[PDB]
Design the sequence.
């Protein structure tokens, strides 16, 4: 029947309203919030679902409800708390983190969202050296893409916040103290050479100014296990580089530390895209390693499991509600029981199996 | 060094520093006068957190052992 | 990973006990140990007594 | 079985015994397959189940 | 056509023994092995030296008992002992066999430095398995 | 074959075994009792009682497989079905209520009706008359008619596509353009029929 | 008498390699390293060269012990394929049978 179809949608567009009662219900993300809060960070296959269905709807789940609860009770005076979303492949870690990014975005937090951190440690076609420190290297294209997305999300706060120091981009170009933070972002996009340095200024400024009570800061890094791992980038001597050497990686490692206050850090682990890690590695120590684990502790691990019986029915009815499951036998009880076995209630596998059907 | 050791020793480790640093920042935010190192690391909250980290490092890491670590962090960090 | 002082000094203590090469020896120079630890081909009973 | 058998066709081969007798979700199986490849191991389990 | 160790058909007047009748593919199926040593077992050495001794020991017995051998000899090695089991026709007088046994044993014990014994079963005439 | 000729092909129809005894024709009823005393071949690894298993598509997959790479061929077919479902959903949403009714969003029904349209009914065959071979129009059999439709599809997409296009994007665009009877593979069917028309004169040469 | 003059030359090569085994070992060891001066290594390169050519153990060829056939030999029995098959096909090799499977 369609009894879970009633449970397959909720009218509470605002993430604050959500609670345990709303579990297993899909809340539509407003169209403006998709083009502002989420210009990046949504999974690639989910983005295909948003285009075809014409609407983004994120199932409310207990893991993402627990996280939103901690964010509501955040003690800004106390140091920032690192929340680590760890789970098996396809369980929904990225979209559980995107749920937290929506809650903070609607309360007027300053979103510092790194959509994927594996992209910064592999397949780089332009790798320059840094003037600030000659040991470090600069990734112009990787930094330029992030800045354009960071600009879109936080466009409102780019005029209020203002630099507290003078930054000399070139001999002929410098940023006077007091100018809006938007100017730092504008120069980075204008001159790609400084793009990897504009990012460092942005991260440094926000971290320092957040403690002054002007704004809250959500450092949401998905794929954080890349920072303390290995790279597949080679130097001019054909010798592999290390994560510390890279400029973007080094700046971020500071933001994920609990030595500041005025915000919260939400981290996620992703074995997908990871370098030199097994396919069946999901636990925090296996993916972070000894260096990554020690860096982040004390952290709060939040397990993202597979769909429970209530959530699987809600997802099954959501696909049926949009006419996605076009096979004649999919709506039947023998189809549903089959799809439960093959997918095993895994969110990603269920989306893949239903995609072909 | 720490890397050489086969059995994790929380005492004089990266964990103890990270825990002590957090507790120092927590008492400072409370506006309390700077406390002693032994005072911060003698509390029961820190005792349990030591036991949980050691289990993850020595006994083994699993969802059950990670759940125990989650509770200790909540008590140590005064999270609801 | 690199070998710290403890690791390297333990490795030399082990080699000293088990009668292994204790110094850092190139792959080329490890043939001298092989030449004098293995019976040469011409000294094996199969070779010199190949024929009745 | 979703982890051990990342391929759908191997999982379908494990589904065939139970789906045929409409006994899905009514039994708990513990398997121990050694030898062969992915497809040969799914088939051996199908017969054993 | 295969010509190996096959006593070919004539016109039904050729006597053949059990050993001769069976072609190589019947080895280990209908007929066994004439020599039994441990040198061809897995992880065992000195197959070449046992095989060379067999070739010589067969040529020695043919010459030492010329025309007196009813069938191929059977060689049995146990420990360092060698045992030669030969079917011999009753052509020679009895005392001559005692001489050739004493001679052939002592000579082959001082040549291979092992205890060698000769076991002789005398037949009235060659045993014919079938006429082919 | 390792199966003796006495072995029987397996029957993997779930409903058939659970039907009431009276609902079965006595011919079908007879075979069941006979099979109790016969040997049964083991089911193939791709033979299941799944409700989503379609023999036509399973056959089409095997005709795309190269070198025993079943995972890749099955993956390409899954991407094709998805590429067709996503192409019809886009058209459906961007269409009026009147147009929306006609649009078909079932990929399995687009695949089957696309192939049937391509099927050629009559194709030229070499037939021997007076110790000489002539090309005489012949009625193609069911199996040969079905094979030709699939082979012509897998061959237009494999070859006559841009270098950077992918098979799920060429095959989807060809199944959809053969679901409306306006494609290259339909033109290939129209050539086989056009050639048989020219050689109708030799039709009577057929002896069956 | 050995089978042929080729087996005779091979036998002598095997007896001169046994005589020069220790010598060619000690001298060649001085060359197979990176710890000794290159002047000594260049000189040891000539002392080993000066030894008689038949002392070199790579000039030995394994021949059938009974027919002196250079190729086709099986090293476990030291017989050519032709001689091996004659003994094997007659039941004279202990445990050797035809392979049917
Ligand atoms: N809360 C949710 N609402 C809707 N769909 C979801 C949700 N969680 C998971 N899914 C489904 O599961 C798929 C995979 O989710 P996601 O990529 O977020 O998981 P993940 O655990 O981060 O994966 P990976 O380990 O590959 O990084 C999504 O594309 C979607 O189809
Ligand atoms: Mg993810
Ligand atoms: Mg000669
Ligand atoms: Mg040679």
Sequence:
């Amino acid at each position: 029947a369609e009894r879970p179809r009633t449970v397959s949608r909720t009218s509470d567009s605002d993430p604050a309203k959500h609670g345990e009662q709303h579990e297993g219900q899909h809340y539509s993300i407003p169209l403006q919030d998709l083009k502002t809060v989420f210009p990046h960070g949504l999974p690639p296959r989910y983005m295909m679902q948003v285009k075809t269905f014409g609407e983004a709807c994120l199932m409310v789940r207990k893991p993402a409800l627990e996280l939103l609860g901690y964010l509501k009770n955040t003690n800004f005076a106390h140091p920032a708390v690192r929340y680590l979303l760890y789970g098996e492949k396809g369980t929904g870690k990225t979209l559980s983190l995107c749920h937290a990014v929506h809650f903070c975005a609607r309360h007027d937090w300053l979103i510092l969202h790194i959509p994927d951190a594996h992209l910064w440690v592999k397949n780089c076609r332009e790798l320059l050296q840094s003037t600030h420190n000659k040991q470090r290297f600069d990734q112009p294209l990787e930094a330029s893409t992030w800045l354009k997305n960071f600009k879109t999300t936080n466009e409102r706060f780019l005029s209020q916040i203002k630099v507290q120091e003078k930054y000399v981009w070139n001999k002929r170009e410098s940023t006077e103290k007091g100018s809006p933070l938007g100017e730092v972002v504008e120069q980075g996009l204008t001159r790609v050479r400084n793009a990897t340095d504009a990012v460092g200024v942005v991260l440094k400024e926000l971290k320092a100014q957040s403690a002054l009570g002007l704004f809250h800061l959500l450092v949401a890094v998905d794929g954080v296990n890349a920072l303390w791992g290995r790279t597949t980038l080679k130097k001019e001597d054909r010798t592999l580089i290390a994560p510390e050497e890279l400029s973007l990686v080094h700046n971020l490692r500071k933001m994920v530390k609990n030595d500041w206050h005025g915000g919260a850090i939400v981290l996620s682990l992703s074995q997908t895209g990871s370098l030199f890690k097994s396919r069946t590695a999901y636990l925090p120590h296996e993916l972070l390693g000894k260096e990554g684990f020690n860096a982040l502790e004390p952290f709060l691990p939040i397990l993202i499991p597979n769909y429970n019986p209530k959530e699987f029915e809600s997802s099954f009815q959501y696909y049926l509600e949009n006419n996605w499951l076009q096979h004649e036998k999919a709506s039947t009880e023998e189809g549903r029981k089959e799809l439960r076995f093959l997918s095993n209630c895994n969110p990603e596998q269920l989306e893949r199996l239903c995609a072909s059907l | 060094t720490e890397e050489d050791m086969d059995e994790y020793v929380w005492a004089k480790s990266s964990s103890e520093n990270s825990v002590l640093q957090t507790l120092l920042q927590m008492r400072a935010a409370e506006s309390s006068v700077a406390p002693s190192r032994e005072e911060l690391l003698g509390t029961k909250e820190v005792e349990d957190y030591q036991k949980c980290v050691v289990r993850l490092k020595n006994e083994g890491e699993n969802e059950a052992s990670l759940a125990q670590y989650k509770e200790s962090v909540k008590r140590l960090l005064n999270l609801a | 990973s690199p070998l710290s002082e403890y690791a390297l000094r333990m490795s030399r203590l082990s080699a000293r006990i088990f009668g292994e090469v204790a110094r850092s020896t190139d792959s080329k120079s490890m043939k001298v140990v092989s030449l004098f630890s293995e019976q040469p081909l011409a000294k094996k009973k199969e070779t010199y007594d190949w024929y009745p | 079985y979703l982890i051990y058998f990342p391929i759908t066709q191997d999982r379908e081969q494990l589904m065939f015994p139970f789906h045929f007798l409409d006994r899905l979700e009514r039994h708990d199986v513990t398997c121990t397959v050694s030898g062969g490849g992915r497809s040969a191991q799914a088939g051996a389990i199908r017969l054993a189940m | 056509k295969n010509r190996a160790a096959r006593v070919r058909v004539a016109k039904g007047n050729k006597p053949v023994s059990y050993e001769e009748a069976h072609a190589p593919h019947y080895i280990a199926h209908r007929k066994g092995w004439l020599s039994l040593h441990t040198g061809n077992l897995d992880g065992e050495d000195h197959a070449a030296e046992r095989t060379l001794e067999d070739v010589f020991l067969r040529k020695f017995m043919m010459g030492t008992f010329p025309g007196c051998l009813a069938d191929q000899i059977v060689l049995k090695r146990r420990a360092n002992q060698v045992d030669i089991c030969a079917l011999v026709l009753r052509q020679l007088p009895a005392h001559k066999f005692y001489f050739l046994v004493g001679y052939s044993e002592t000579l082959l014990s001082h040549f291979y430095k092992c205890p060698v014994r000769l076991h002789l079963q005398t037949v009235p005439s060659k045993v014919v398995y079938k006429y082919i | 074959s390792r199966y003796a000729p006495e072995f029987r092909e397996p029957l993997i129809d779930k409903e058939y075994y659970r039907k009431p005894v009276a609902e079965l024709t006595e011919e079908e009823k007879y075979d069941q009792e006979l099979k109790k005393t016969q040997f049964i071949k083991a089911a193939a690894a791709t033979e299941t009682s799944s409700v989503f298993a379609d023999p036509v598509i399973s056959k089409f997959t095997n005709m795309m497989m190269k070198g025993g790479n079943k995972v890749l061929a099955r993956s390409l077919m899954a991407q094709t079905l998805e590429a067709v479902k996503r192409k019809q959903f886009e058209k459906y949403r961007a269409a009026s209520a009147e147009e929306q009714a006609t649009i078909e969003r079932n990929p399995y029904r687009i695949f089957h009706e696309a192939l049937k349209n391509c099927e050629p009914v009559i194709g030229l065959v070499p037939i021997l008359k007076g110790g000489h071979f002539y090309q005489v129009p012949v009625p193609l059999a069911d199996r040969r008619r079905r094979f030709l439709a699939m082979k012509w599809m897998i061959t237009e997409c494999r070859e006559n596509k841009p270098r950077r296009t992918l098979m799920p994007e060429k095959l989807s665009h060809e199944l959809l353009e053969a679901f409306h009877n306006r494609g290259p593979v339909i033109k290939r069917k129209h050539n086989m029929h056009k050639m048989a028309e020219a050689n109708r004169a030799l039709a009577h040469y057929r002896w069956w | 008498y050995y089978v042929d003059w080729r087996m005779l030359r091979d036998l002598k090569r095997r007896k001169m390699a046994y005589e020069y085994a220790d010598e060619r070992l000690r001298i060649n060891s001085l060359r197979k390293n990176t710890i000794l001066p290159k002047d000594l290594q260049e000189m040891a390169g000539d002392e080993i060269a000066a030894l008689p050519r038949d002392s070199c153990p790579v000039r030995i060829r394994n021949r059938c012990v009974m027919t002196s056939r250079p190729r086709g030999v099986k090293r476990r029995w030291r017989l050519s394929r032709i001689v091996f098959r004659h003994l094997a096909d007659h039941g004279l090799l202990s445990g050797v049978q035809r392979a049917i499977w």
Notes: The pocket of magnesium ion (ligand 4) is lined by residues G 61 (CB under 6 Å). The two ends of chain F are 33 Å apart (CA to CA). Chain F has nine helices and four strands.
